[PDB]
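Hi Q.,

Before the meeting this afternoon, I wanted you to have the 33J prediction in hand. No need to reply - just skim if you have a minute. The sequence and ligand are here:
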Amino acid sequence: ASYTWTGALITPCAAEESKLPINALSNSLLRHHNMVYATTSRSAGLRQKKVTFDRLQVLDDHYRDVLKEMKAKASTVKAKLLSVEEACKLTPPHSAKSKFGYGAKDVRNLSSKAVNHIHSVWKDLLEDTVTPIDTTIMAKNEVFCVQRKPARLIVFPDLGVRVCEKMALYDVVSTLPQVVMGSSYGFQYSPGQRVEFLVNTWKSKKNPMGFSYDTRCFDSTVTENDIRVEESIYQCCDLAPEARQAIKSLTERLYIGGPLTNSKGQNCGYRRCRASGVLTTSCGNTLTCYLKASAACRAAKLQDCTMLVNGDDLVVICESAGVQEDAASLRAFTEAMTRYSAPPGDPPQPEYDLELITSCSSNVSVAHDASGKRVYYLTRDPTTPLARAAWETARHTPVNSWLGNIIMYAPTLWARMILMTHFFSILLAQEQLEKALDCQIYGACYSIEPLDLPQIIERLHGLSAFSLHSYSPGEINRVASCLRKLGVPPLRVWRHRARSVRARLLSQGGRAATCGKYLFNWAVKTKLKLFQGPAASQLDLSGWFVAGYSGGDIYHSLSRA
Ligand SMILES: O=C(O)c1sc(-c2ccccc2)cc1N1C(=O)CC[C@@H]1C1CCCCC1
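Predicted structure with the ligand bound:
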């Protein structure tokens, strides 16, 4: 059973905002504020019913053939332990405080109280490889639009354990998946690299067929054998005997399961599946999903199939054998996945147009550059990104989703017209363009200076990201519908706001004038010629798009010279 419950409630640790706070700045983004809600602990019971069930898992020679192949590639990886200090510097500054009298700032500053407790948690992992470690169960406060959705749940150990996880497994979860999975590992790609992989893979098939597979409650479908199988993959690496012991221990004491404690210290129940807030959530889920999907591909006898995995998110592109044969092949793949304990949520179906395949809430779309050439870029429905941006305008947040969206979806119609214009306008008026903001890229937290956005966008997306026009009608209709749905002003209100912001930025010189020139070139009557090359101070963007760290509690720093 994925979970058992004591009856104790999942409790909030503070007052939870449920509805969007009206603001004379929030209303300039969207009028219809009633459409925007935030999930709360009051819907935890609805989530608990969904995530609670018995698993049925039947492994076969296909699963075993794939596992052995993965284990072979895993054996070529050498991973080193991090020092207490290396692991302390990887902690986000607003990471949950320890129950042992210290917090993220104390960990990041290497306080004797933190460090000495971190040494003791570590010594216990080496001496006890059995006693379940305590975890906290919370309900996530995530902002959405109505179409009404229950709070997703977060399970995580204490700050001391989290630093110990980094020490034992940061090098593994950063290095291992790409070696084992190759081109199928999604987090090695920037949005543009993902699109390149998808478009080239589609173009490589005589008769392309594609599909996304949605596993219903993937974390709940992850059985204790699944977590023992990931550890056996981790143990295939060239590791020091101390890392091996800490990895074995972290597995049996934490990753396979353990007791759930609410915010007021009451025992909620017991977990026997994936913890969403441990270092290995991303890596483990990616390995497990790729393993199950790769073996199901063989069971289904799918022809020349290529898959792209990002945690629980899977997309498979193969050679179509006709609509009838493809539906039957997909029944075979779904039946195999079900046996491996990965049954579908939304049932999969073949698709014969790459724009119509959604994976990672995203799809490949097409636009034209300044020279009129076709440019494939990654887009998504802008509802959730826009609703979150409205919430971030009204109420202060530690992590700014609008900036991570501007970075990942920079070539898109909606990020450029709305998000860039809105937040550069706010930052100008507030005199805070220089101030670095915290945001997430593939789960990891980064402190990014907004004045560096033309340089960031150019490196990840290309100079075309500033000249894209003639977007597909399907993209336009989805964006247009969303503006009409949420009460977002039309293009003409955004072009005046953009021209005004552009003039104001150019008058300031420096990095500000670069933002004006580059970001808002779409606003002016006749676009200026833009040329490629580096900026006066080039950031180190190599650590970005290496691995996924969602739930991992990872914080990355930016170099420059
Ligand atoms: O060229 C286009 O296909 C479109 S479709 C569209 C549109 C569709 C529905 C609602 C609102 C806007 C606008 C454009 N664009 C133009 O007027 C010229 C380039 C620009 C986009 C470029 C990206 C930043 C914002 C403006």
